[PDB]
């Protein structure tokens, strides 16, 4: 029942600072140390530092001196990491993790939080354009829709309000002109479309966008 609770994702501008939190429960806070770990998109884990909550002793990765500052609040069983003077190189998922019981200076972690995604960017919230993908002209027919030029993540795509689920593929977004683009596909029997309506339902919560785009043969 060890629990490490971390905020969901955050978005800040270059030059800002953030103070990440990690709320621990299920054990005696002061009897176990706490670690922080960085993970850049598509890269590996990188240790930042550890802190002893009983007396706020810390040791750290020298690459983060002047960048990361670890503290605790014993009365609330929360650990904090402040990141200063942020740049795009600081965009990453940041994890807290409890240390195995130990009186040593350095020791491995056991339970991890789920991580806080921090994005450092000057881009602005932008709703996507939603484009239907209809074929040229076969027993299974594949349709799709292109969700182009939105920020920030995520977007959700369903087909026929969820009635079509088999053979649905949604692809990871890519950066294009410093906005995100993604696509989704559905494969149905050729007796189903265009005889029956196939509609892709796109939602981009950050922009309050909800678009229902019917797929019809190209003009």
């Amino acid at each position: 029942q060890v629990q490490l609770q971390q905020p969901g994702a955050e978005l800040v501008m270059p030059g800002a600072s953030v103070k990440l939190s990690c709320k621990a429960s299920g054990y005696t806070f002061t009897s176990y140390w706490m670690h922080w770990v960085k993970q850049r998109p598509g890269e590996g884990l990188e240790w930042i530092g550890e802190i002893d909550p009983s007396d706020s002793y810390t040791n750290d990765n020298q690459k983060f001196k002047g960048k990361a500052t670890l503290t605790v609040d014993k009365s609330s069983s929360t650990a904090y990491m402040q990141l200063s003077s942020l740049t795009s190189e600081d965009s990453a998922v940041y994890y807290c993790a409890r240390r195995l019981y130990s009186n040593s200076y350095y020791y491995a972690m056991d339970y991890w939080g789920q991580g806080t995604s921090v994005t450092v960017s000057s881009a602005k919230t932008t709703p996507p354009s939603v484009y239907p993908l209809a074929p040229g002209s076969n027993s299974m027919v594949t349709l799709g829709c292109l969700v182009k030029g939105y920020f920030p993540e995520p977007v959700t795509v369903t087909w026929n309000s969820g009635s079509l689920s088999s053979g649905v593929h949604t692809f990871p977004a890519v950066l294009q002109s410093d906005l995100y683009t993604l696509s989704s596909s559905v494969t149905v029997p050729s007796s189903t479309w265009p005889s029956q309506t196939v509609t892709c339902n796109v939602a981009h919560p950050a922009s309050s966008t909800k678009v229902d785009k019917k797929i019809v043969p190209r003009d």
Binding site: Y106, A134, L146, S185
Partner: protein, 212 residues
């Protein structure tokens, strides 16, 4: 400072097979090494610490061995739930993670189902034009997609996206998009995406003609 050199960066394993990952430290770490499993969207999970000591609950098919500077981690009788990314960690002097090993499940080859789509009328009212190609349910992940416009290869302006390996049949899917200006698109009639893959000697070709 202790550097950790973990190998390999990526591995393919067969169901029921045996996986080995090695980790080499720049100095003696006196068996203070741990191994972590990491799956997308979840926190990592400690499997082994002090070189060979399994945490309670971790399956016996995970194991670790080593001393001094040289260590390894093994999975025997590999099961689908073991497909993940794995990391070593030294904690003898500060902490240092190795670069990570990505596992994939080796399965039977599969040729892609290929589909090509013209720009929509809606996008063409905006002066941009995207041609999209989907390549679904193929294995291995190693695939070469080429765009040809009126017979000539177009290499620039293409963006690709791969799904993760499918949890139900271990295949991959891929999306390739060629984004042009509207006038560039209207200068040509024939658009082709062709995929070269282990599953066929000749490419899988899908085309359309803009004026048809």
């Amino acid at each position: 400072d202790i550097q950790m050199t973990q190998s390999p960066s990526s591995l393919s394993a067969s169901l029921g097979g045996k996986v080995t990952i090695t980790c080499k430290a720049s100095q003696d770490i006196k068996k203070y090494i741990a191994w972590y499993q990491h799956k997308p969207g979840k926190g990592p999970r400690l499997l082994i610490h002090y070189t060979s000591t399994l945490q309670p609950g971790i399956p016996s098919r995970f194991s670790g061995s080593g001393s001094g500077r040289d260590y390894s981690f093994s999975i025997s009788n590999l099961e689908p739930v073991d497909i993940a990314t794995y990391y070593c960690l030294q904690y003898d002097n500060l902490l240092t993670f190795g670069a990570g090993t990505k596992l994939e499940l080796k399965r039977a080859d599969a040729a892609p189902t290929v589909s090509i789509f013209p720009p929509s009328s809606e996008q063409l009212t905006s002066g941009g034009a995207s041609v999209v190609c989907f390549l679904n349910n193929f294995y291995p992940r190693d695939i070469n997609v080429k765009w040809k416009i009126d017979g000539s290869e177009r290499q620039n302006g293409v963006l690709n996206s791969w799904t993760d390996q499918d949890s139900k049949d271990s295949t991959y899917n891929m999306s390739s998009t060629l984004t042009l200006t509207k006038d560039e698109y209207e200068r040509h009639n024939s658009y082709t995406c062709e995929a070269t893959h282990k599953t066929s000697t000749s490419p899988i070709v899908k085309s359309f003609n803009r004026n048809e």
